[PDB]
Amino acid sequence: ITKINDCFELLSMVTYADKLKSLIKKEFSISFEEFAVLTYISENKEKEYYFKDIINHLNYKQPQVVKAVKILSQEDYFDKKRNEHDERTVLILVNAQQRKKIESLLSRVNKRITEANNEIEL
Amino acid sequence: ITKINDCFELLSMVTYADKLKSLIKKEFSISFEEFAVLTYISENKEKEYYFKDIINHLNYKQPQVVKAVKILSQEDYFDKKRNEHDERTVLILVNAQQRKKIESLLSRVNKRITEANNEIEL
How many A/B residue pairs have CB atoms within 8 Å? Predict the structure, then answer.
């Protein structure tokens, strides 16, 4: 929504945002890395993504990711391949059902947030 | 003013924030705990402060705090005097001129936040 305007606001958000990250992790047994990839996919409806652009959009460093990319593809949340461009490039494909499997579980997540926001103060 | 509604806003916010969090803890060589303590001081303008209070009002872990304190305390932002078992009853005195020092460091940190909101997309 809006940009944080100062010091007081910077702490409120961090404090708040963290409460939400923990609830989720706990409530769903998922890391924010995992949460981030999924959430990225969902908003960027594509059948093919490059980890090179998901990493940078998100703002991480390869390692933090991959693991999260291991557990996810292998949980069947998307298909992961690594062919051609220097053994480097890893491409994640996402078909209609994986794409619903995701869209579904994040719907679970949106429910909670709304709820928690009823008692998670300023 | 502005709770986050979904998984997207949450990611957009967490990302954007974390960016301020490190931009700041880098140009001021300060930690977020240290940031926290000072912003708090500045928000609840009191002559003396009890750690336990501050320790909660924030949301962190004692160890995290103290550390930030002995530095700020040492750096002169406030003063710390311990008193019964010399245990968890550490007081923190903040005289008028530390209230201007803090007041001016935060004052600067605000300038930055305003600027960085022009180089960062939420």
Answer: 95
HSE-CB of B30 using CA atoms within 13 angstroms: 24
Elucidated via:
X-ray
Cross-chain residue pair B42–A1, CB shorter than 8 Å: no
Beta bridge partners of A80: A92
Q: What is the resolution of this structure in A?
A: 2.6
The C-alpha atoms of residue B100 and residue B93 are separated, in whole angstroms, by 14
**CATH 3.50.50.60 corresponds to the domain B1-122:** no
Q: What does each C-alpha distance from B64 to A103, B36, B80 come to in angstroms?
A: 38, 11, 16
Rounded to a whole number of angstroms, the CA Rg of chain B reads 16
Nearest CA in chain A to B14: A17
Task: Give which of B41, B35, B37, B44 is closest to B17, Cα–Cα.
Answer: B35
Q: Which amino acid, residue A56?
A: N
